[PDB]
Ligand binder design. Structure first.
Ligand SMILES: [Mg+2]
Ligand SMILES: [Mg+2]
Ligand SMILES: [Mg+2]
Ligand SMILES: [Zn+2]
Ligand SMILES: [Zn+2]
Lengths: 95, 167, 221, 170, 152, 43, 192, 38, 80
RNA sequence: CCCAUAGUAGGCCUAAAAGCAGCCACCAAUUAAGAAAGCGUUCAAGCUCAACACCAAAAAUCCCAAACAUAUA
């Protein structure tokens, strides 16, 4: 959160997070959504866009990121945790 | 030398033997008092906070018509206050409540299909009449909809269910 | 969150002079007679300021020692700096310096009669209170400056409250009741079990193990 | 960024406090003063009121404005006293529940109150909390304010003569 | 346990998959025990050499596990962390050499490089004696009559 | 290095002697003997 | 090296008075140095220029002020009246500082032209001679003190007499060291 | 840098650690807060 | 800066001044019965009553409790 | 870790006391944010905290016995 907003997350363009509210292993994705919907992270980048799909069909949360360079990152956020996903996101921003 | 001195006057050897013999040997059981015993905790008392909260949530649910919840987007304070402004223009009653206290109520208010829904941060918004079109057009005017698994007129609906009920 | 109540009270009434009174270097009538170097007034426990009076939080002396105008000025000035007069009031339990001491001319040979007076000092024994404080204050906010004053003091001292002093006393009592060591200086000295009354003093019969010189060993039981 | 501060509809030409900050922000004192006057001079002159302004990276600004100060409105409703020594406790200043209702009605225009729901009970609590600090008591169905006016005149006379004595002593 | 992998042209996929979770024995010798040492009668009867249980409370790189997950006492946790430092320093755990792009040794409390050498050892009454082991294992049962001599 | 000021066992600074479990057990043995003496002197 | 102090039986000599007299000599020397003109503008002018309008003397300090702004151009304010302006002007002109008095309203401009290197010479030598007179005063004071001390060598112990001698000598040494410190400091100041 | 027996965190950025046998206090924001343990 | 003028006591009693935000100035109607609702009637004028009588369940009770807690916390922090 | 809207720059003489020059009170809006706890600003501004949410060591001819962790008092 704080580190992400500090590093500014400039190259990123699009950030999808999709999930089903009734699946169990989802609170990690919800925390990711929260920290990405925080004020400073979205204020740093207005051209960037975040999209939260609350689709109920299926039982598999997923995360997706598209960068200005065009790189495509995907996370199966079922057996993953919030801080881990954030560290991976920061590392790929560094990339 | 004198008895009283600034420095610690070294004592006689016999006296030091006596002082080395005489100490507090703490009476300890053979078993450490933590690993084995495991004492039970008292029946912690219940508080007027949760009492009033239960009464308030009852007055909410057993008096309104439409219920919904949406994840706390956590946007700016002024922007969120403007949000609340137009939402109260649209009459919706929007609040939050701690999950730690709301889950037990949800376990006996005949709402046990929602217990998995509530976790982390959230925002609960209710009406006496449906405001589905306006709430959903606000929540799709925003760049991402946080709504999830809300219940109207004692009927649990999803996002697609809300769209259907609005059309 | 678990919320607890805030302490309420109305029994507190602050005097007109909450600040500490100025302490003179010596009395206005210097005594011409010079006194000896008696140390029993430093050795052993105290009996005049062991208990509290119209106060809540004080400084306690574990070991004995002297106090002169330097220490008095330090305490007074720092407490007046750190204290809010309308909310708290402080008082001295230590009487003014009356005990004289003499110091001959430096670089002078031995003898030639007793030296003349230089200044006066106040003695203090262990288990004695020196400064008391009362008001709408707890102990935690006061710990800071009280215990820094204690560390500035020559002898070992502490910041203390009535509850903490009672805690100390009762825990020492239960320790001396529950010690598993069958042999205690109490018994050994009162019986003279090995003629150790040679190495020991008659004072030890009541300064038994806790005291050595002016010092005080609280862990000793 | 954003600056929220009081302003005077009557005098805004120099802006001794506003001029410097506005210059460091880059906006023009002349432009800001013109935009202020355009909407303030056509309505009122000689009144304090809070205002919010914001400077953009392209320097563009828009002057939003709410209502005047509850402090000023209460000062106008009651006699000019500008607080007093030992305020809050004593009963300086007289107001009634009709004044309460009317000031709630006029504060309903406030932007923050327009943003919020501001139930009438909440507005009443807010205004009475302000009055308790200003040193204003609200009497229900008061009469014969003239004796109180004379009492307060004597009180202010004592105040000013004590101030004169202090100045002479200093 | 779960294994995570981050793998494609211009695209990348991060995935965590569950793994085989081992379990304890079905017959706890000492019930009513909140710590494993008390459940198995291992409170004062272990050391650095008996690494079979130490291998259970370590990561493959050689890292200590957290108390909140392992369910141990604070004293026992610090005991085993010191003991694992001792084991690593002795080199009994070669497979857990952490991550990449000379002398025999044992019973070493502190790190080798950090310690400065004593260019002078004082007299008998204030000698700079050398540390060994730790006071943590001082409570360990000593079958010998003399106690453990921790400072040489 | 490590000298003791003046004589090794007297004065303001002397050589610090320390006690051992040997002497401790010796003296507590003697104290138990003294306790038995007290008992038999009673009655 | 070592400093000695005696606060005891001494009966025939008083050391407090000797210290007071040495400090008074130092004060007189400091006063003479401060009177001595300097390169920096108006050290002594404001505080030791005399006015004549009133029968009772009043220093220029008491009627004027030293709350100025610029060093390049020096003013002086007339605090009491805008009529003692001329009084202070005449006082400053009669003062032996060779300044420039100009009048404006109730303020007086005082441009300072530099005084005649030989001016530094004369000032340093005045300082030196004041130092010499102060040293002579100290010598006479201490010699008279030593005389009244040794007046009673017979009854009092000899060791006490000679240690009091040592104390007086060391005190005079400290005094003369302070005097030399002042002289050198202000000589460097004059040269600056 | 300065050596103190007792250590104190001046600012939140000051973080204390145990390195090469001694206690250190480092602060990148305020390097003057660096503090060794004697 | 300062107000323009304050009217007479009886005039202020009859009408509230400073209410009109326009230059013309207007008198406001008045009535005790309909202008005042029941909650306004029962609204208390004195200071907030004491925690001894604040109901344990009322929200303002715990509000006051939290206020006292933060007051003492601020005092402890100031004294450090 | 987390985040921190504002009635209100509360009033008082100053160039301002916007929360921090000081004095009086210290209530009150939102379920929550101190008429302001610590920094900082000439004053402002701005940053954190509280709140609500989630869950012990130095000296001089060259230190000083050497070694030891385990086989029953
Ligand atoms: Mg003797
Ligand atoms: Mg010897
Ligand atoms: Mg916080
Ligand atoms: Zn255990
Ligand atoms: Zn730092």
């Amino acid at each position: 959160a704080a580190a992400l907003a500090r590093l500014g997350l400039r190259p990123v363009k699009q950030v999808r997070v999709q999930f089903c509210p009734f699946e169990k292993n989802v609170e990690s994705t919800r925390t990711f959504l929260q920290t990405v919907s925080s004020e400073k992270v979205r204020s740093t980048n207005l051209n960037c866009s975040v999209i939260a799909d609350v689709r109920h069909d299926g039982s598999e949360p997923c995360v997706d990121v598209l960068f200005g360079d065009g790189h495509r990152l995907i996370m199966r956020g079922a057996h993953l945790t919030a801080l881990e996903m954030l560290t991976a996101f920061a590392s790929h921003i560094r990339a | 030398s004198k008895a009283v001195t600034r420095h610690r006057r070294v004592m006689h050897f016999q006296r030091q033997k006596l002082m080395a013999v005489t100490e507090y040997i703490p009476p300890k059981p053979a078993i450490h008092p933590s690993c084995l015993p495991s004492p039970p905790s008292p029946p912690q008392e219940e508080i007027g906070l949760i009492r009033l909260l239960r009464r308030e949530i009852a007055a909410v649910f057993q008096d309104n018509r439409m219920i919904a919840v949406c994840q706390n987007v956590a946007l700016s304070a002024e922007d969120k206050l403007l949000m609340r402004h137009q939402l109260r223009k649209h009459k919706i009653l929007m609040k939050v409540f701690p999950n730690q206290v709301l889950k037990p109520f949800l376990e006996d208010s005949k709402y046990q299909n929602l217990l998995p829904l509530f976790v982390g941060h959230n925002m609960l918004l209710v009406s006496e009449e449906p405001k589905v079109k306006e709430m959903v057009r606000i929540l799709r005017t925003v760049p991402f909809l946080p709504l999830l698994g809300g219940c109207i007129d004692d009927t649990i609906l999803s996002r697609q269910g809300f769209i259907n009920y609005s059309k | 969150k678990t919320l607890l109540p805030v302490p309420s009270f109305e029994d507190v009434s602050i005097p007109e002079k909450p600040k500490l009174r100025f302490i003179e270097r010596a009395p206005l009538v210097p005594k011409v007679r010079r006194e000896p170097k008696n140390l029993s007034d430093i050795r052993g426990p105290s009996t005049e300021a062991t208990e509290f009076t119209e106060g809540n939080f004080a400084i306690l002396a574990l070991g004995g020692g002297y106090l002169h105008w330097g220490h008095f000025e330090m305490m007074r000035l720092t407490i007046n700096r750190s204290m809010d007069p309308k909310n708290m009031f402080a008082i001295w339990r230590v009487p003014a310096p009356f005990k004289p001491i003499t110091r001959k001319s430096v670089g002078h040979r031995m003898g030639g009669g007793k030296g003349a007076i230089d200044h006066y000092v106040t003695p203090v024994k262990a288990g004695r209170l020196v400064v008391e404080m009362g008001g709408r204050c707890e102990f935690e906010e006061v710990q800071g400056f009280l215990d820094q004053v204690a560390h500035k003091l020559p002898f070992a001292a502490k910041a203390v409250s009535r509850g903490t002093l009672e805690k100390m006393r009762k825990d020492q009592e239960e320790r001396e009741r529950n010690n598993q060591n069958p042999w205690t200086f109490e018994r050994i000295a009162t019986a003279n079990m090995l003629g150790i009354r040679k190495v020991l003093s008659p004072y030890d019969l009541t300064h038994k193990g806790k005291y050595w010189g002016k010092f005080y060993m609280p862990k000793r039981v | 960024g954003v600056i929220r501060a009081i302003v005077r509809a009557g005098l805004a030409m120099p802006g001794p406090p506003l001029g410097p900050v506005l210059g460091q922000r880059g906006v023009s004192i002349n432009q800001f003063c013109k935009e202020f006057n355009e909407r303030t001079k056509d309505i009122k002159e000689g009144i304090p009121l809070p205002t919010k302004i914001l400077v953009k990276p392209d320097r563009t600004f828009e002057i939003k404005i709410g209502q005047p100060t509850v402090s000023y409105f209460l000062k106008a409703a009651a006699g000019i006293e500008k607080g007093a020594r030992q305020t809050g406790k004593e009963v300086a200043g007289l107001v009634t529940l009709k004044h309460v209702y009317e000031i709630a009605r006029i504060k309903a225009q406030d932007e923050a109150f327009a943003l919020q729901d501001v139930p009438l009970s909440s507005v009443v609590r807010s205004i009475i909390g302000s009055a308790r600090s200003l040193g204003i008591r609200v009497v229900k169905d008061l009469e014969e304010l003239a004796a109180f006016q004379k009492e307060r005149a004597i009180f202010l006379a004592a105040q000013k003569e004590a101030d004169l004595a202090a100045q002479e002593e200093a | 346990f779960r294994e995570v992998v981050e793998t494609e042209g211009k695209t990348t996929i991060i995935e965590g998959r569950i793994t085989a979770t081992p379990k304890e024995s079905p017959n706890p010798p000492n019930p009513s025990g909140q710590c494993p040492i008390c459940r198995w009668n291992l409170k004062h009867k272990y050391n650095y050499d008996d690494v079979l249980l130490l291998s259970q409370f370590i990561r493959p790189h050689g890292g200590m596990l957290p108390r909140k997950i392992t369910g141990l006492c604070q004293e026992e946790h610090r005991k085993i962390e010191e003991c694992v430092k001792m084991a690593h320093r002795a080199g009994l755990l070669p497979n857990h050499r952490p991550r990449l792009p000379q002398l025999n040794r044992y019973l070493t409390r502190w790190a080798p490089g950090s310690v400065k050498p004593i260019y002078k050892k004082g007299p008998r009454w204030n000698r700079v004696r050398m540390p060994v082991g730790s006071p943590l294992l001082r409570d360990n049962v000593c079958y010998s009559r003399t106690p453990w001599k921790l400072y040489h | 290095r490590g000298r003791i000021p003046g004589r090794q066992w007297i004065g303001k600074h002397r050589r610090p002697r320390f006690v051992s479990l040997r002497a401790k057990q010796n003296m507590i043995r003697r104290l138990e003997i003294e306790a038995e003496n007290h008992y038999w002197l009673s009655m | 090296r070592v400093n000695i102090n005696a606060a005891l039986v001494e009966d025939i000599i008083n050391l407090e008075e000797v210290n007071e007299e040495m400090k008074s000599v130092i004060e007189a020397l400091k006063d003479n140095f401060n009177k001595t003109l300097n390169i920096r503008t108006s050290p002594g002018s404001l505080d030791k220029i005399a006015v004549v309008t009133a029968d009772g003397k009043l220093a220029l300090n008491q009627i004027s002020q030293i709350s100025m702004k610029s060093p390049q151009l020096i003013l002086v304010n007339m605090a009491s009246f805008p009529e003692c302006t001329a009084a202070a002007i005449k006082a400053i002109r009669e003062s032996g500082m060779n300044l420039n008095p100009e009048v404006e309203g109730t303020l007086i401009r005082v441009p300072i032209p530099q005084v005649t290197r030989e001016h530094r010479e004369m000032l340093v030598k005045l300082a030196k001679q004041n130092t010499n007179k102060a040293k002579d005063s100290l010598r006479k004071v201490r010699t008279n003190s030593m005389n009244k001390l040794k007046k009673s060598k017979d009854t009092v112990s000899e060791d006490t007499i000679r240690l009091i001698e040592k104390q007086i000598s060391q005190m005079a040494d400290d005094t003369v060291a302070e005097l030399d410190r002042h002289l050198a400091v202000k000589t460097k100041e004059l040269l600056g | 840098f300065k050596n103190k027996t007792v250590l104190k965190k001046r600012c939140k950025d000051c973080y204390l650690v145990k390195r090469r046998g001694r206690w250190y206090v480092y602060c990148k924001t305020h390097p003057r807060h660096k503090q060794r343990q004697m | 800066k300062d107000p323009d003028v304050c009217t007479d006591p009886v005039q202020l009693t009859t009408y509230a001044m400073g209410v009109n935000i326009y230059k013309e100035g207007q008198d406001v109607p008045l009535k005790p019965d309909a202008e005042y609702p029941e909650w306004l009637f029962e609204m208390n004028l004195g200071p907030p009553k004491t925690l001894e009588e604040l109901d344990p369940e009322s929200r303002e009770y715990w509000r006051r409790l939290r206020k006292q807690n933060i007051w003492r916390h601020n005092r402890l922090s100031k004294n450090k």
